[PDB]
Each structure stands twice: as C-alpha cells, then as structure tokens.
Design a protein around this nucleic acid. Structure first.
Length: 148
RNA sequence: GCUUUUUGUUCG
C-alpha cells in the first residue's frame, strides 16, 4: 500500500521518495555485480547502496537498498529491471522494487554509522557516493560513528 | 539447479 511504487506519481512529482528496496536478488550476487547491474541503466544517479549479507552463510539475503539523488531515476531503473530475471546462477527470481521504510541518505547514514555491519569486510558494508557537483557519483568514506 | 525479503541487540 504505502511502499508501492507508482511511476505516474514519481513523474507527476507527487511522490518525492528516493530510497527504494531492490527485492528478489540471487543470493550469490555480490556488491560489485549489483553496482555493475545498476550502472547499465543508472550510472551516477544514486548516492547510497546497501546489499545485506549473511555473514555466516557468506552470501546476500535476497534484497538491497538504493537511494536515488532524483526520484525520476526510479522510473529509469524500474522500467529496465522490474519484472526481468537476473540470468545468473540458474536463478528463476524476477527483479522487483518497493519504497524503503528508511528514506534519505542522511537518515540512512544515521542508521548505519553506529552499526556493527560497518565493522565487517567493506564489500559487506553499506556504501555512499557524492550526491552533487563535479564529484557526483564518486564513492566517499562513510561518516565515522558518534556513539556514547 | 542457486537459496534468507524492509535493513544484525539474536552470527543461524
């Protein structure tokens, strides 16, 4: 209901949400393969990316999270991938998306900066990329923790 | 044939 993606509301500017859940991902798909998968259609249009990893079984958990700098980049990705199979690892999964429950790079940094997922391998951690300017799209170090 | 489905306080 609430996390349903409607491309007509993105295009009309009613729904200004930028964080999206990338659901139904092959479990042996990696952070590199996902960045590459997105970069086909949406190179430099996103400023956050997090593919959740099972640290014990050493493979993704079936979903990822991406934040688009502009909501209209959700139509570009959505129209290209939603409803399509991945063609890797004999997986019959089909790509799908929905809005994320945590919206925005600032809110996502708040959440992840003091997390124990930041203490793991960098390929297992959430990543961020410059949102605006001539450095737009370049990977940035994640803001350090601020616990007590 | 390849898997966790709204983000690890639970390490599966």
């Amino acid at each position: 209901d609430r996390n349903s993606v409607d491309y007509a509301q993105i295009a009309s500017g009613i729904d200004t949400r930028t964080t999206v859940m990338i659901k139904n991902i092959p479990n042996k798909f990696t952070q590199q393969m996902l960045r590459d998968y997105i970069d086909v259609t949406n190179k430099g249009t996103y400023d956050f990316l997090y593919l959740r990893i099972d640290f014990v079984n050493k493979c993704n958990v079936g979903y990822a999270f991406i934040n688009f700098i502009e909501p209209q980049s959700i139509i570009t990705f959505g129209k290209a991938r939603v409803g399509t199979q991945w063609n890797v690892f004999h997986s019959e999964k089909i790509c799908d998306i929905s809005y994320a429950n945590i919206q925005g790079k600032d809110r996502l940094i708040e959440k992840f900066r003091n997390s124990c997922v930041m203490d793991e391998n960098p390929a297992y951690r959430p990543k961020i990329f410059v949102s605006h300017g001539p450095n737009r799209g370049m990977e940035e170090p994640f803001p350090a923790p601020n616990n007590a």
